[PDB]
């Protein structure tokens, strides 16, 4: 395992050193998005939570394509506000229910240290 906790204060610094293989070592789901919501990275823990195969969703748009249940003010709305403002750090619970058994998670969205990409971190609750 990679030794970093969900919701860590400096998580964007710690994850700046991870290629796909190291992200796969996290204890929680990690998705990196560009400012439009396109998936840049998607780790193994996330695939275990939601069933998606990482290489099949990278390059897709998370809000339009992969996760329409997140296309709402309560999720995408927060994301887009953060992309627009150029800062994002929000944690909230949510239920993922598209083509899957509804699964309650805790989500932490945080702007990456890199200028315009955004993490979506997920763990079960
Ligand atoms: C709602 O449509 C949620 C979908 C979803 C969330 C997270 C994933 O890893 C994959 C799909």
User: Could you tell me if the CB of 46 is within 6 A of ligand 1?
Assistant: yes
The total of structural domains in the chain comes to 1
Give the length of the chain. 125
Task: Give the distance (Å) from ligand 1 centre to CA of residue 96.
Answer: 6
- The answer to whether the CB of 105 is under 6 A from ligand 1 is no
87 CA → ligand 1 middle, Å:
23
Complete DSSP assignment for 16-47 = GG--HHHHTT-SSEEEEEETT-BEEEE-HHHH
- Give CA–CA dist 106/94, Å, rounded: 6
List beta partners, residue 38.
61
Quick one: DSSP state of residue 103? E
At 50, give phi and psi (nearest 5°).
-110, -10
Residue with CA at minimum distance from ligand 1 atom 11: 67
Kindly list the distances between the CA atom of residue 29 and the CA atoms of 51, 81, 84, 86, in Å, as whole numbers in the listed order: 11, 22, 24, 23
Q: Domain containing 32 — which CATH number?
A: 3.30.450.20
Nearest to 86 by CA among 60, 122, 110: 110
CA of 72: how far to CAs of 7, 10, 78, in Å?
A: 23, 28, 9
C-alpha to C-alpha distance for 21 and 101, rounded to whole angstroms = 27
Q: Contact at 8 Å (CB) between 117 and 35? A: yes
Q: Where are the beta strands (DSSP E) in the chain?
A: 29-34, 39-42, 89-96, 103-111, 117-124
Tokens found for residue 40: 């840049």
Name the experiment that determined this structure.
X-ray
Atom of ligand 1 nearest to the CA of 70: 1
CA 95 to chain centre: 14
Q: Is the CB of 50 under 6 A from ligand 1?
A: yes
Query: Can you give the residue range of the structural domain that contains 40?
Result: 1-125
Using DSSP's 3-state secondary structure scheme, residue 85 falls into: helix
């Amino acid at each position: 395992m990679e030794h970093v906790a969900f919701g860590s204060e400096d998580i964007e610094n710690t994850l700046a050193k991870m290629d796909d293989g190291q992200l796969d070592g996290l204890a929680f789901g990690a998705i990196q998005l560009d400012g439009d919501g396109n998936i840049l990275q998607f780790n193994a823990a996330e695939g275990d939570i939601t069933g998606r195969d990482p290489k099949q969703v990278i390059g897709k748009n998370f809000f339009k394509d992969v996760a329409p249940c997140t296309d709402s003010p309560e999720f995408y709305g927060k994301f887009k506000e953060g992309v627009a403002s150029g800062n994002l750090n929000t944690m909230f619970e949510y239920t993922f229910d598209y083509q899957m058994t509804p699964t309650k998670v805790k989500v932490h969205m945080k702007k990456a240290l890199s200028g315009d990409s955004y993490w979506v971190f997920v763990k079960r609750v």
